[PDB]
Amino acid sequence: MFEARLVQGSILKKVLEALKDLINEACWDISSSGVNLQSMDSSHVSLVQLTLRSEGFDTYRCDRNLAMGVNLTSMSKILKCAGNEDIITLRAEDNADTLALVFEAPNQEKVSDYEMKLMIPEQEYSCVVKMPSGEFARICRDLSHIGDAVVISCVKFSASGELGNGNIKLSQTEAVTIEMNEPVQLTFALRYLNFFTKATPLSSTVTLSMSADVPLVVEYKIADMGHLKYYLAPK
Amino acid sequence: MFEARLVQGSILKKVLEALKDLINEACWDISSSGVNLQSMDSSHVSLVQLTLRSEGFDTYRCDRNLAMGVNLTSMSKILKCAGNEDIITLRAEDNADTLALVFEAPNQEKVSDYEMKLMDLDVEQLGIPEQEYSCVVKMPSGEFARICRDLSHIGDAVVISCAKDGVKFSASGELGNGNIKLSQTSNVDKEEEAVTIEMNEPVQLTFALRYLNFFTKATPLSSTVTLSMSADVPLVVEYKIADMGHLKYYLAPKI
Amino acid sequence: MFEARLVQGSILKKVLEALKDLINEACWDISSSGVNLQSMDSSHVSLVQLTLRSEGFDTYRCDRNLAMGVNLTSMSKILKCAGNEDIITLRAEDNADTLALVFEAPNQEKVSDYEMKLMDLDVEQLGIPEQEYSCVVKMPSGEFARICRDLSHIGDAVVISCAKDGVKFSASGELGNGNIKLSQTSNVDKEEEAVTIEMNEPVQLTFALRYLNFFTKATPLSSTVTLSMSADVPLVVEYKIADMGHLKYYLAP
Amino acid sequence: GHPYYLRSFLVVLKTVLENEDDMLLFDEQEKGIVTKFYQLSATGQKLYVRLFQRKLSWIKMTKLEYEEIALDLTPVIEELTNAGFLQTESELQELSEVLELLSAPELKSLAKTFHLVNPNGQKQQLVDAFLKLAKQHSVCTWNKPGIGAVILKRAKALAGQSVRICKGPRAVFSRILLLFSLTDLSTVLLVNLGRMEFPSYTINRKTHIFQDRDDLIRYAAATHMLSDISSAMANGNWEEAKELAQCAKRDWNRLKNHPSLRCHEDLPLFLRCFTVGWIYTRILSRFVEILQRLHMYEEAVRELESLLSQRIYCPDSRGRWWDRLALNLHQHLKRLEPTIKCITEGLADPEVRTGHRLSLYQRAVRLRESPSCKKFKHLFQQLPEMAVQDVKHVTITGRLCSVEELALAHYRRSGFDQGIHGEGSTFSTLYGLLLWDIIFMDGIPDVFRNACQAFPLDLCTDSFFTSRRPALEARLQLIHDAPEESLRAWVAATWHEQEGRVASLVSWDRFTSLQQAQDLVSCLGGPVLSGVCRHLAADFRHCRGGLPDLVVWNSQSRHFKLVEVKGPNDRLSHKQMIWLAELQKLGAEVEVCHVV
DNA sequence: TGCGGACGAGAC
DNA sequence: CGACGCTGGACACGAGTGGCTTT
DNA sequence: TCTCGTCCGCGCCACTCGTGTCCAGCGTCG
Ligand SMILES: [Ca+2]
């Protein structure tokens, strides 16, 4: 038996919209701590780590931990059948082959149920930039529109392409701040970087963490109670 | 040779947004009481009955009844020409197969005239003899449309069951299973959000879901939609129109 | 050694994306003083020109002109990042190697920079002198965009039929014929929605509709548009840019 | 003149119509159809033959382009329709055919019109869904017009004009082609048949392969179903092949009691190979192949055992089945004593010869030395010993030319200038050149039926050395002791008298010139040519293949080395081993060139 | 049936 | 005005049919 | 690892069409 009632169903909708194409199949590990997802991306250079505690859920009961392997396409399509304010309930018995999503609007005149078929060392980063997700999303999108690879420098994004080159210099003072502990100049791909930007509504600002030969980390923080981190292998 | 003028012309455009997907072409019966469509879908599973009474149409005069079959997609393309506020009037010649639609601007400064080929085809008759339906449900059109879309996200069939507790849609597919439950609320204010249901017989019956999606294209016509069914009768989905007409979709059982 | 600055960087973006398809691999022949370009369409049937006053911009670098060999698709790709409210500076690197476009936000905390290698440029320099046009009508550009769109939906050739009282767009196609009559606004406001008419003699001539769509794609740049119609000569469609520039299209039937 | 396809069709038709015994089985209506075909314009015949070679299905008039016949072929289509050979789209009253006629975009548009479940999908699934929708949904829906009729009308209107060859005349002409192909449209015969000049002989017919129209129709159905099975094997749909073969076996079992078959068993073997029972036995052999492919080894064994008791149908292949019953009894299934019994019966069987006799024998020793069969001390009981003497092996290193070309270059460096590589065609061609007068001799009945027969029917059958035994023995003894000048004269006379005449044996492109043939004949000598010609005359079917590839020789030294080249991933088949041993016995010098 | 690729088992 | 969701056009494949020698 | 036995796939070329995949224009709702 297991229940998880979340009033802000739009949060779940957008977090599973972010992982729509990053991973094909993944499992929703659940314990007394909460819902954790450590997923190996379809591409072999990236990793996904979503963490949510058990405090924000209105109800939570995990007698036995369940992997909850769900095809993200199917469950994302099911979640698309819920409104922004639709309260979303995740349910799965310890011996249940199907996962239930109960959508109940706050006005309570409507209730629906769906059933779907169930089937990195820690290291402090030398530099980290906390800047709005919109800014980095626009930079990555435009620099992928100009080229295929972008190098980040201590901030500067420089994209190299067959047609030409681009170089953008940022400033610090929705704010942008850098620890400027070390200088870096490291290249990265754009397709996975572009995929890592569908989580713009998922959080306000992203903290891009980089250092000397440490994998790139993007972080989108839920307003509370959880967060999400995408790891990308540097080129 | 008949003339039909209408002020809130977008209403007519909304009608063309609903029939276009369902019926490629239809017979446009003309009468003094009102203009009827009385056509059915190509695949012989669903019927669409459109009635626009002459009372709503200001300056309505028709010499004789006309068939004037119309290519629905072509008429929708012509009606896309106007805006959401232009007044629209249609003129039909005594015998020439050229329907002329002219739209005037809300401020009466932009006038647009167009003509159509107005192809002639057969005019069949579908009785749909009045059967007393049960478990009549009156609900907002938007909720019904989004419920239909959500269920079409899963499978290719739907089942509808009405009981004293409320109405229940359901759809099971290979990907998964789902269902929608709606309960009567009986709003005091009745801001077109009431889901009040009259109960006479606890029936349950099955339909296809693509045709429900094609029926949902009539949602902009009015906020309220009436769904009625019984043990064996076809499902009836009625949208009122500006207190002057109606658009009804009848769907046969899935089995 | 060429420098141009514009606080309202949006207008250049709209100007460039307007021409992103009607001319490809076009030419840039901006003189030493004054900005101007002209190019024949890819179908060799119509012509597009634009003139922006040098003093209209903020600053200028005292030097000679260069080919400024520019390609729109590349430019658009580069300029797509530029915002619709930021300051835009165009800088020219010597030896005709690259052109740099620097976009800075008014907040001056998310500044940027850009540049791109250019391409071999051939000068066509049609330079057709202007001739007097008989019928002229000034009307909102959104109205023209809507008219062009629905006529393209319903027809293939657009008829002007310039007249003193008003205008009458006419066309036909396999789904019948369509006519739209616009009357004189005659309102005290004389806003951009208002249409003005100046006639000497009516002129009737049919024009292609696909390139009409390609040219009306420049609708968001200007609030209004002036159409000049005369017999046996290409139609003139003209857009105003803050009274600081003129974007013209010659449409030969 | 007529094009090549029309030329071949008229030659086939004329040859079949000349066959008085083969003309009688055709019904008066079928003869009327054939004589209606001759009452056509040249463009009409050209278009009909062009459509005949295509598939049997509806074809759009848009996809009918033929610049050689006419720019506008509509009058020709109308003439054919009036004649009765082509049925236009007015007769397209079947939904399953009109749906298949429509292209994929058109079918997708039709599915979108009818609100199908998957408008964007495969064509086959679209046709299946359309059939399913046509089966119901319109019987009671608020007149009672079938929705299938509406779908058919819409599809017919969408597809436009479309023609298809009629069933009747197509079947009649297919049976005419089959009657022609009894004595041997195939592509090799579709083109050049009008220009190929067949050899000369006297047509002599005494017996009827088929007795009546029903027998010929049954044989045509059997061979058409065999062709369907063969196409299933070629395309890899082995389950469809298994189902078709099961249906064929049930048909054969139903037909085994037909008294007409009691006449077919009295036909000579070379003529008995053109009966319904022979085709059904061949179908059963293909069924055995299917079972072996799909791993019902026990059922394949049972089928082979049933076949091996039918000494009347396909006795020449009795070796192929005995060998596979041994392999399907020892390797795939681990029976050992029944395998030994099968080996003994196969070796004692007179119809097992050359490679398929060696293979069994090899299996025999593989069971006479293996420890698993030590208790079975009978395989040594009689086991008629056959031994093939080993031949010399020479290794070659090298690596863009073919392997055989590399070996030819090697032997060119070793003092053997002249060298050719045609495998069997070098010895088969030489045998044909030497014995053209006896292979195509007169006096043998029921072996020359048509005029377009490239070889007597006795070939690929032991009876070739039974009917013509005196002349063959006289010639093979005369060649044995004959001077090189006489052999040169014989080969030159045969080449000059019959130049360009097609034959199943002689390949005129094997020798670049007559001088090369003369030199090869002189170098091979008398005994070698006599031996190879005798081994090809006796049981030609089992001695046709497995011959050495290259014949390399030097003119001055008169030294030759029949070389069998095996690539790095090749092996000596049993037929090749038998042929190499036989050539070793004849005094010819033979060795195996292994190229790495 | 006749060719060429490949893999699988007994003996190293 | 813009980012998201939806949808049709363009595109490298592999499969199937057809023509192969009026020269 | 080496050797022998056994199985699997083969008309030929070009022309068009089915097919799953990918990219750019379009209506919209906060
Ligand atoms: Ca060989």
Author numbering:
A (entry chain F): 1 to 119, 128 to 162, 167 to 185, 193 to 254
B (entry chain E): 1 to 255
C (entry chain G): 1 to 253
D (entry chain A): 371 to 512, 515 to 556, 571 to 785, 811 to 1007
Give sentences from the paper.
To elucidate the impact of the HD-associated R507H mutation in FAN1, we generated a full-length recombinant FAN1 protein bearing the R507H mutation and reconstituted the ternary complex with PCNA and 5′ flap double-stranded DNA substrate. Although the overall conformation of FAN1 and the angle of the DNA substrate remained unchanged between the FAN1–PCNA–DNA and FAN1 R507H–PCNA–DNA complexes, notable conformational alterations were observed in PCNA. Specifically, the R507H mutation resulted in an increased distance of 16.5 Å between H507 of FAN1 and D232 of PCNA. This shift may allow for the observed interaction between H485 of FAN1 and Y211 of PCNA, a residue previously shown to play a critical role in modulating PCNA function. In the mutant FAN1 R507H–PCNA–DNA complex, H507 of FAN1 remains distant from D232 of PCNA (right). Furthermore, when the FAN1 R507 residue was mutated to H507, the interaction between PCNA D232 and FAN1 H507 was disrupted as evident by the increase in distance between these residues in FAN1 R507H–PCNA–DNA complex. Structural comparisons between the FAN1–PCNA–DNA and FAN1 R507H–PCNA–DNA complexes reveal a slight shift in the alignment between PCNA and FAN1, suggesting a compensatory effect at the PCNA-FAN1 interface. This shift facilitates an interaction between H485 of FAN1 and Y211 of PCNA.
FAN1 (FANCD2-FANCI-associated nuclease 1) is a DNA structure-dependent nuclease ubiquitously expressed in the central nervous system and peripheral tissues that plays a role in resolving interstrand crosslinks at replication forks. It possesses both 5′ flap endonuclease and 5′-3′ exonuclease activities, allowing it to process DNA structures that arise during replication stress and repair pathways. FAN1 comprises a DNA-binding SAF-A/B, Acinus and PIAS (SAP) domain, a tetratricopeptide repeat (TPR) domain that mediates dimerization and protein-protein interactions, a virus-type replication-repair nuclease module (VRR) containing the catalytic site, and an unstructured N-terminal region. PCNA is a homotrimeric ring-shaped DNA clamp that encircles double-stranded DNA after being loaded by replication factor C (RFC).
